[PDB]
Amino acid sequence: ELLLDSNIRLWVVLPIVIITFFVGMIRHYVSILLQSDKKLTQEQVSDSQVLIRSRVLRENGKYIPKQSFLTRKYYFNNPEDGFFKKTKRDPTMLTDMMKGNVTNVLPMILIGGWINMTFSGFVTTKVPFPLTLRFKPMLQQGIELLTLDASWVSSASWYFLNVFGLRSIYSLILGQDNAADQSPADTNKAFKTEWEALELTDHQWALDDVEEELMAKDLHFEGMF
Template sequence: MAELLLDSKIRFWVFLPLMAITFLVGIIKHYLFIFMSNDKTVDKQQLTDSQALLRSRLIRENGKYLPKESFLMRKNYFTNEDSGFFVKQKRQSTVKNPMSDPKAMTEMLKGNFLNMIPMVVIGGWINWAYAGFLCTKVPFPLTFRFKPMLQKDVNLVSLDASWVSSASWYIINLFGLRSMYNLVLGENNAADQTKAMQDQMSGAALSMPDDISKAFKAENESLTITEHKWLLKGIEQSFLN
């Protein structure tokens, strides 16, 4: 098969414009998300409970670096049968249906709007303006299993799998500009499409359990059975030797 040669104008009218448009749309989406989002108020009691669970987990995981007296003192603060934090604090179950929360539904709709509308609009524009374009080629050979991923809208069986179509180049930029967004906008930005999809799948509410009483009971049992194992025993002698 003869080697294909791309017109140099494709670099300036297809390759670079798609990358620049994808990047600028991500920047605009980030600031629109900031403009449209409401300030989230955190309940003081929920914050205290979540920090207590986090502190207890850290004690279980890193207690081996503490002296035994310090570990037992912290353990007693949480698990004492009479005055322990997990025993003394009583919480009511706060299981909420996110579908019945207007604020949660509004935030979800805003996120879906800002994530899906640009993808649909730009994807339709690419299919209309650059349908069937090959805009670049990866500098290493690939197997034919990569053809559906790299050559969207280009149905040529005999074409080398290393060539990249315009539609596939847009998708690569959509998920591949993460480092650029982190550099320009910071780590917690709304332009990162990968992070947006993860947030939609996991949900921000997962950071706080629905039934805090069950969480306290489970953490109390886990911390109670945790034994202290001094990891730094004899560390002074190792330094002297």
């Protein structure tokens, strides 16, 4: 094998892991710190909640008798009622959203480049599986060897593997669905599509057969204590 310098472990292997871990934490914390809710007026939240109610009605009107459901239908999408008809109305925001979307991967690539410069010329670890030779130019950046096994990796690709393998850990410790990783606007069209969808929907009162399906079995009663 190869008698690698022990100091390469104490100053090039572990620091990379620590950097990746804390950079992920930093990135997640900066993401949550930067996020500020945009102010919403009454109309937008009102229409969003109205279409929410309409959709949940479409979803589960089955537990509601037919007349209540078709009265709901009349109220929402029907000329006479009026509802769903008389219900309608470098930029800073684009730059901000583009920067926010960019800051999820670009900092990682910049850190990788900085590491590649800072830690150029080493052999950090041997990958325990026989990688292909064609992957040599990128795994062994900063190494002048020619016949070296492809399983030996430079600092940059080791950092890349580290950053690839730590997202699950981030979700494990930081919390579920953390932001440290690598990866309605229009109501008129929404109104019309809700109109069409709830027009297409039908009714099936799920209570039409609850009694018969209840009479079959006795009521659970144990554990009353």
